[PDB]
């Protein structure tokens, strides 16, 4: 409904506070997003 749109680099973060951390513990992120590309001509 309200997409996260940072506008300078470093504007919104995602936080996880763990309680127990083992060896080789990681955090696997997965995003979906909208973006605009280059060659903005729009079917010339």
């Amino acid at each position: 409904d309200k997409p996260i749109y940072t506008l300078q680099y470093g504007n919104v973060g995602f936080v996880v506070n763990p309680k127990t951390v083992n060896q080789n513990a990681r955090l696997l992120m997965g995003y979906e997003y909208f973006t605009s590309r280059t060659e903005l001509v729009n079917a010339g």
């Binding site: 506008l7 300078q8 680099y9 504007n11």
Partner: protein, 84 residues
């Protein structure tokens, strides 16, 4: 747009029992005066900044100077006595 049956016609509606006529009439609901309560604060400590941002970063510069320029001991050429 029905067609009248001439062999078996019918008449208009006859009176039937009714639904107690005042109980189909509503009251007009009587609004009292109201108030958006409290004294509102003038400003809010917003979680996002209200100004523009920049998409790309541009390299900035500032001018510097060099230093006091000295002389030099050049290696000097030979004399052009028709060999050169």
């Amino acid at each position: 747009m029905a067609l009248i049956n001439p062999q078996f016609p019918y008449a208009g509606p006859v009176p039937i029992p009714g639904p107690a006529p005042t109980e189909t009439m509503p009251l007009l609901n009587y609004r009292v005066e109201g108030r958006i309560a409290g004294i509102q604060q003038a400003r809010q400590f917003m979680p996002f900044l209200q100004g523009p941002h920049r998409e790309v970063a541009e390299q900035t510069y500032y001018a510097i100077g060099t230093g006091i320029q000295m002389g030099q001991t050049f290696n000097q050429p030979l004399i052009n006595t028709q060999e050169g």
